[PDB]
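Structural prep section.
Before we set up the soaks we want a predicted structure of the protein with 630 in place, mainly to decide which crystallisation condition to try first. Input record follows.
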Amino acid sequence: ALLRILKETEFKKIKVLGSGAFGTVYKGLWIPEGEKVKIPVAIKELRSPKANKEILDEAYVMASVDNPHVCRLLGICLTSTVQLIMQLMPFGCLLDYVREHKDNIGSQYLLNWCVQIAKGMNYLEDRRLVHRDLAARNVLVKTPQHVKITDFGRAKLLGAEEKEYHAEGGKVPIKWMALESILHRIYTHQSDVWSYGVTVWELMTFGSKPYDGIPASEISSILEKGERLPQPPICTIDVYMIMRKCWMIDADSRPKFRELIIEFSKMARDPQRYLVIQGD
Ligand SMILES: *CCC(=O)N1C[C@H](COc2nc(Nc3cnn(C)c3)nc3[nH]cc(Cl)c23)[C@@H](OC)C1
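Run finished without errors. Recording the tokens verbatim:
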């Protein structure tokens, strides 16, 4: 995967898909100059600018991320704005998907999603990328059978010598963060594992809100006292204990994504043994 540069004439915005501080995402059509083919795309138009060279170099890095469970950057357009042209995931974010189809989602799909997200997170770790924003809202659905992680700008590349990322002032998704990230602004692959654990909890509760109604400011205190998100109704204890492992104080006591791939793959071979869903 390489970074190609698009001219504004090459693509068209059709419809708004979402937005935030980062910018706005549109459903779009990309027609590579002279290729007479329509490619469905999601166009991310980002909100003192960096130099064009800096932006392209970062974009070259992003485009090199090539894994079945990470949403790929296909190209970039630099005009007055930065526009990132990404793969269009037909079924939207996974959070909305599980809420919408909760009556018709079985154990096989849930456990397969856990495997796939772990696989994508493991790939990012191999690339020395800490995500720092993993949550069901940031996983996308290619098909009910296939999901992809995406990134809205919080991810950081660790240099050869860096074992962690030390954050600055940016706003933080408190209820998804590891205790050490909240307390000391330290992020690692193992703090992504904590977030992976919360993400799994979201899936297993069909998109329920973590620490529902509790102010984010009280979260560090609750975690420091040893409280964690509750066992979801459909979860056998074996599955809940994996989640609980993701939330242990010592980051190095938490499983690594490679280990989570193995564990969930094992469960996914006998899904009804590990998740209990009526009519499944
Ligand atoms: C739960 C989070 C959410 O609703 N978001 C909306 C928006 C989506 O960004 C992308 N959307 C798609 N496909 C899509 C969306 N809706 N349908 C029906 C299909 N594909 C993408 N590929 C890359 C990105 Cl980014 C998107 C996000 O807003 C922040 C998350």
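Observations: The domain at 1-88 is CATH 3.30.200.20 (Phosphorylase Kinase; domain 1).
Flagged for discussion at group meeting.
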